[PDB]
Amino acid sequence: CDPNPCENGGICLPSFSCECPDGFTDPNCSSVVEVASDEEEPTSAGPCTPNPCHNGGTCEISEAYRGDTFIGYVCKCPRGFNGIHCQHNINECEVEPCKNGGICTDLVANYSCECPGEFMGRNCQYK
Ligand X SMILES: *[C@@H]1O[C@@H](C)[C@@H](O)[C@@H](O)[C@@H]1O
Ligand Y SMILES: *[C@@H]1O[C@H](CO)[C@H](O)[C@H](O)[C@H]1NC(C)=O
What residues line the site for ligand X (CB under 6 A)? 56-58, 76-78
Q: Is 107 annotated as a binding residue?
A: yes
**Gap between the Cα atoms of 17 and 29, Å rounded:** 10
CB of 4 to Ca ion, least distance (A): 44
89 is a site residue for Ca ion (CB under 5 A): yes
**Gap between the Cα atoms of 57 and 83, Å rounded:** 10
CB 86 within 8 A of CB 75: yes
Q: Is 94 annotated as a binding residue?
A: no
Return the number of the residue (21 or 56) whose C-beta is nearest ligand X. Answer: 56
Selected binder of ligand NAG within 112, 120, 121, 125 (CB under 6 A): 112
CB of 92 to ligand X, least distance (A): 18
CB of 29 to ligand X, least distance (A): 29
Residue 79, class by beta-carbon neighbours within 10 Å (0-12 exposed, 13-18 middle, 19+ buried)? exposed
CB 108 within 8 A of CB 90: no
82 is a site residue for ligand NAG (CB under 6 A): no
CB of 90 to ligand X, least distance (A): 14
- Dihedral of CA atoms 19, 23, 25, 29 in degrees, nearest 10, equals -60
Q: Is 7 annotated as a binding residue?
A: no
Q: Which residues are annotated as a binding site for Ca(2+)?
A: 89-90, 92, 106-107
